[PDB]
Structure formats: C-alpha cells, structure tokens
Amino acid sequence: GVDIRHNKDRKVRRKEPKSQDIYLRLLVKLYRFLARRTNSTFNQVVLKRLFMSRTNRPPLSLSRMIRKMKLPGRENKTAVVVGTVTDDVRVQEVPKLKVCALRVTSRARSRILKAGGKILTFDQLALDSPKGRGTVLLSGPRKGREVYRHFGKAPGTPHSHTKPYVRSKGRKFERARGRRASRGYKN
Amino acid sequence: PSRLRKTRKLRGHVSHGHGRIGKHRKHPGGRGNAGGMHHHRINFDKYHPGYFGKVGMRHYHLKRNQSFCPTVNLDKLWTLVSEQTRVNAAKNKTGAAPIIDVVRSGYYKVLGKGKLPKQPVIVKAKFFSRRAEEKIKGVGGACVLVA
Amino acid sequence: AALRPLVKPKIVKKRTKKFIRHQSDRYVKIKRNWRKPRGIDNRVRRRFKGQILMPNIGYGSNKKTKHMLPSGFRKFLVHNVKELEVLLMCNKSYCAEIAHNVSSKNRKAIVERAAQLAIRVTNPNARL
Amino acid sequence: SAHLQWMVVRNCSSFLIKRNKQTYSTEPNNLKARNSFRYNGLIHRKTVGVEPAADGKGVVVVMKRRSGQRKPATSYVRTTINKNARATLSSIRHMIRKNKYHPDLRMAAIRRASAILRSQKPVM
Amino acid sequence: KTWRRWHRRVNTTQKRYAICSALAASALPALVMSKGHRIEEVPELPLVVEDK
Amino acid sequence: DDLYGTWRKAASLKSNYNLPMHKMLNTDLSRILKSPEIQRALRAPRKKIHRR
Amino acid sequence: ACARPLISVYSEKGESSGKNVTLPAVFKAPIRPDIVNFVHTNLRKNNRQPYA
RNA sequence: CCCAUACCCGGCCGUCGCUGGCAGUCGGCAGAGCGAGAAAGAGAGGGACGCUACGCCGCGACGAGUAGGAGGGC
RNA sequence: GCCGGGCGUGGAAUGCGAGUGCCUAGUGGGCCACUUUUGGUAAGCAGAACUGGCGCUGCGGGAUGAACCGAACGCCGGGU
RNA sequence: AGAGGGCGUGAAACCGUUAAGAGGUAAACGGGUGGGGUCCGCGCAGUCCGCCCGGAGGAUUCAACCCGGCGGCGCGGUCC
User: Cross-link position, Glycyl lysine isopeptide (Lys-Gly) (interchain with G-Cter in SUMO2) (chain A)?
Assistant: First the structure.
C-alpha cells in the first residue's frame, strides 16, 4: 500500500510523428541520432518540433522571417523553421537568405532564389551544420488560426471579447438581448 | 470505416457507453432548439448572447448586387499588375507612372492598409477612403475616379 | 536421436489450467471461452474468495520461453517445400509444422526435404 | 535509394511472410531469410547470396556489380563453387573480407554456405 | 439506403501526386520485385521499346 | 516530360502543373551518418552495458 | 538527383538499338506510399454500384 | 506462539518513467577505450551475436475498480 | 510614470518538476460512523456541519454481516 | 445406402444402449494434490559439434607458378 496518485504519471507528449510520411520518417531517423549523440540542445528542439501536428507547426510567412532577420546581431546566420515558408505578397524587396524549412511554396522559392538566396532542407542542414551552429530557429504564428478567437472565456460574459459561433452574420444574428442595453442587458 | 468506430469496442459492455443510471432515452431535454426561454436558459446566455429579439430596420427586397463593393488594400495593390510593370517604373527616368486599373482586377473600393513603395501610380478605381487617398498622394501618385 | 534445439531452458508456467467462462458448467449455451463478467453483483467480477479466477496480465509467461513447445522449439506453419528454405538458418530454434490441408503426396516431399535441411518437423508421421 | 526503398517494403512486399509470431522474407539473395535491413537483398547496392548449386553439389555465390543498378539482367554475377568444406568456406570468406564487400556479412554468409554443404552431404 | 455516400472526391493535385509516386516506383528495380513481378532477367527496368 | 515536366520546366500539356518537391534531397542516411562532418561533432558512444 | 541517367530503347527482337532517351524527371519524384494508398482507396469507391 | 492479497527479500508479467542506451559491425587504407566523484583534447605543427531503428537493450518505481474515457489486438 | 546605474549569503523548516490550452463522457435518488448538532418521547426516523468510509472493494479479524478493527489487490517462493 | 424416394452435409437440446467410474448433507464449481483410465511419447540403453593427437586406408591432391575469363577498389596523390 503506497499513498500516491497515478492520475498524471503517464506524460502526454509525442514520441514519434503520427504522420506516415516516409521522408518525414527518414528525417526523424536522422535527428534521433543527432539529438542523443550531440550535446547541442538545438537538435532536441528540432526533434521535438518534427513530431508535432500541422496545427502546431504553422506556416512562417516570408515577411515575418525578413522582420526577424533584420535584427542586429544576425544577417550571417541561417534561417531554420520546422514548418513551411509561404510567400508574402505585401513585401517588395527581398534580401538574400539562407533558409532551411520542411517545405517551401512554389512562389516563395522563386522569390527567394531570384534574390540570390539559398534554400536548404534538413538533411543538408545537418551536413552543413550538425550542432546547429549559427542558425536562428523560428516559428510561425501559432495562435494565428481562426479557431482561437472562439476560445477563452465564453461570450455573454463581462469583458469576454470572444467570437461566438453563428451560422451567418447580420443584423439579426446575435445582435439582440445579450448585446444591447436596450434589450434586457449587456456585458 | 465501421471497424475504426467506437461501437466495436463497446460490444459486451451493457449500457453501450451511455450509463446505467441515466439511460439513453429518446429525448430528455426536448427536440431541436427547445427551452430557449426555459430549462435551457443558461446555455443560450452563456454561448449565444443576443439570440432572442429584434433590432434594426426590416429591408424587404434585398438585392445583393446593389450593395456590391469588394475592397482592396494598398498593401497588395501592386499585385494587381505584373512584376514587369513594377520594375520598369523604378528603372524609368521620365517619371512615367503606371496606371493600375482596380476595377479591371475586380475590386471597387481602395482602402489604405499599409505601406507603399515610393513610386507614383494613377489608380483607376471607383471609390477611395480618406487615408487611402493620403498614401497615394504622399507617395506622389494620383487618385482618378471612374464609373 | 532427435534434432535437439539450441538451448533447452526449463519452461515454467504460472498457470496450466484453462480459464473457464463464469457458469459455463451450469449451461450448454454458455460456452467455455472466457468472457469477462460485467454484472453489477457478479462474484467473479469482484474477486471473491474461492471463485473462478479472472485472467490478468500477471499470468504472462516469460518472454524467454514464450510460444515455446515442450521440445524447446517454436512452431512455424508450412504449406509447401518452398516455404521450408526460409527455416534452413533457424534450425536450432524454429521447428516446422506441415499445414492440415496439405495432401499426402505433398507431405512425403516436405518431410525428407526437411530431413535434408535438418529442420525438425512436429507432425512427420502424417496421413502417410 | 536503399534507406528509402526499405520504408516502402518494410511491411508490404510479396516476399514477406508473417505467421506464428515470426516474420520472414523469402527474397532470393537474403541469407538468414530475415525481414531485416542488413539482410535484404533487393534493397542494397552490394548484396551477397549463397544458393545451392544447380546440380545439387556445391554452392553458387551471388555478388551484385555496381555498374548495372537498374539493369537486373546483368547486375548479379554468380560463381559456382564445388570444392571441399574448408576450401569453400575460405573462398567465400576472401570474396568478402579481401574485397570490402559487406564485411558485416562474412560470418553470416559462412553459416549459410556451411548449412548448404552439410545438406548436400549424404543423409543418415 | 441508396443515398449512402458511395463516391469520393480527391484533390486534382493529389491525383497527379499519386501518378508521380507510382511512376517513380516503377523505375526502381527493387520495388517492382517486391510487387511480385518476375523480372529477374529483364534487360533494363524503365523498359522502352520501338514505335514499331 | 510534357505531361508532368521537369522541376524547372513546367508541364506543357497540363494547365499549370509541376512536379512535387522533395522534403529531403539526400535520402540515404547511411551515406550521411558516416560522413566526416557528422562524425566529428558526436560524443563517444557509451555502449558499455550496465546491469544491476 | 544530381543527374538523370540515359535509358536505351530496345528493338522488337530484344537487342538494344543505338538510340538513347533521357530519363524523364517524373521518375525522380518523391515516393509516397501514404498518398498512393490514400488516393487508391478513395478512387476505388467511384466505380461502385449502389445497393439497398 | 498462530496468520492477510499488508511489510521485507527473490523470480516472472505488464504499465509508467529515465522525453535512458545503441547507426561504432569505424579490421594488414586494421590496432579492439570513453563507469570517468570534480566547466573541457586517447587533437594536429585471421576476429561470435547484433540494428523487422514501428528494432533491440539497461535501469528504477508502480499494479483495486462500477458508470465513463482511451490505447493495443499476429 | 519613465529611463540609467549599483547590490545574490536566493534571506524560515520540510517535501515535490511545473505551467497552460483545447475537446469531453458519466453524474446531478445516495447512504453509514466518531465528534458538533436542530425537530421528535423515541426510532434501523427526519434535517445539517467536519473528516473518513460504503457506493466503485476484494483481503485478515468481529461465528454470521454493504459501513466496525486491521489493511487496500499483477502472478508466485521464503521470512515477518 | 455410413446417398434408400421430404433421400447432400447431419450440430445442440433430448433419448436409447454399450464401456468406465461414482453414489446418504441436491447438483455443479474454485484451489491443491492423490488414485484410475485414455491415448501419446513411434520412449527403452541415450548427446552431438568443432579443434588437436594416435593408428589403419582411399584420392589425383595442397602451396607456389603459367594461360584464359569474371569481379571489387582506385587518393591514377592531379589517366583519357
């Protein structure tokens, strides 16, 4: 008789990707090796991020990484992002880049490579930098999905600016009693 | 796949995943969206505020084509023309500014949502905002109206 | 004179009797195959003294001797002579077993071929 | 490539057979017939294969040349060996050890050849 | 009921993706063996014959 | 080369199709893991087994 | 795929003629069984007859 | 002095944890180590087994269960 | 309210990795006991507080026993 | 005909019979052994495997060379 609780002794985390993609499953075979035989904690983060679901590795825009690479103590390092690099049409000039991502959209290749940049894949990243030396590990906006605007405290609550689920928006869809001070009350 | 569904794992278990005490009866709370002002009052206040009541003017014969005005921001304004057009202006030395016909692309109103590259344009649109007019003027362009 | 295995370890089983379904003796509609009782008052379910035993994972045999025959081998079903060339490199670990529906003219080709490849057969003296 | 194609056939191939809690591969040039990465014959660019001789006396050793990789008609080279037991073992040991041709398979291919030679030895 | 959803639809790019992955695996002389095909003697795997 | 095209020459007989991209160029990690670039950045294998 | 090899056309009698065709780039596409097994087990449902 | 499914000791099964270890099978293009209390360099001027990596291996700790939930079913 | 600069003996003992977000079933008749306690002559009565039980739980003991005393359970050998 | 005119296969409940065993706390069951059958083990003189020594044989016989063929690697430090 031991007085403990087995409620949360099984840690909930991914230990291998649910995806059956063999090219993804080959990368994990490569980085499982690099994570445990190098003391570099960079590879442990990349290993953990390869397991994650698509909703946990959101796309990195092209202008976001430009915004993060124009920071001072940089511009020689390499851009490493486990998600995918989409092209941002609302930026005009493109500096030359050294990018490593899982997947690059067709327009974002042509716009990067036209600027004399360089696109890398994760097998070529390990060849050029095994321990992750001189790289900047980035991530797209994780809570930028439309879904999180419904989360939080429920709507119809004091100071709970949360988007409700409505089948269509209009003047006669959730503009009455809970919302107008003239109709009953409001929050 | 019926072989992946839950009912395959409920075979043998008596209540079939619906409890012995509170059995799976036909309709315990009523059919549909019932009890709005009644025994389901809390659910409609906590998750659908504003569901009950009327507001506004009843417009009878709404013809959606009249109120049609698809806007375009100034951020993606140059995406309406080719990259050849955008480069041949910064290379041009006569000050010759390209004309962007917005209506041709499909939009009507121009709103100014961001920065602009400093080279003049003459946007042939149908509606403008105030701030949108400022950005185009301040760059050095012109705002021409068309119907 | 037999084809002795690699090593013959002392097999030790935690239980040798089968598990019977609850009340499988009192009825003929209740077959012997184990079904976990889910009744709310069932004695067997709530582990009373002197009842039928419920199979746990605690009765799991040793992994060193799991699926091991008394002869220190492990079975492998075989349908034709071509499915024997697999086992010519596991001679001291895996025995061969000719499948049921293999005819009598094909059984007396497998057994002596399995005598050439030195693979043990668990049902050699077949229909014959 | 080799590591790639293994993922495609690790669990779905016409040479794989699973039953009785075991797993086997009936591939031609797969000594030990094991469903393994090392021992698969279709996967790698350099494979070793030891089959019984066509008459029933001796062994043939199958090596795979490196030139023809997508030309299967000429890729595999076979050399029939019919010598004594100590000489046949030393001949297939030198083709592996003194050619650097899957040196992790020398002892494994020696077992298979010895097992074949003992089979071709007269029965009691 | 007759109005069970029988037919399924797949994106046109994935339909084209599957043709790419199918043709490329018909160029590896190892996957064609594992599919069963007795081609242990064919001269070259991406077998091309004359227009005659 | 006209129904699917190369990676730098889009397919002529499709609307705007082009081949899919590769998620990793150098596929065989065997030739990778035995490289001097990797093998210099690895701590020594602690393979001496420790039983109770 | 640092290069695309050269495939030889075979004549009607089995010999290899003088001509040589460049290996098309489609044969170098990624090998995705998961997509092939997805697309195949969703296009096989479109020839299906109803029953009720 | 007697004995419980409790406690100690030992075996075996399983789960959980160490997000543990192993691509180093590096062989006459060889030279067999990384259990070491102490932030860091065995640095250059003919030879068993193995590793279905979705595999294998080592340590600890833990194990009741209706309604209910999930995972695995060669 | 801003900047800027300087100070770690981490300023009680003990123990332990935490934080955080989704989706969510069942339930919404309970019952018993030490102590406190209201109505009632009282009740295996009705109604509460606190904690633990039973329900969902076998086991050793109380001959017998939903709740008491001990003690909570993978399958086994030895000891206690 | 162990396919005999509602006739392919011919299960269970149930019944008849034969064979075996038992029989005053209804039967049946769990755990533990014991006895008895049943067949099986094709059990009954119990291991092969290398390696070296000793004694009797028999081969076309080893090493090293010569010619032909095939293969591997090449940092040929930089072959065409």
Answer: 118, 163
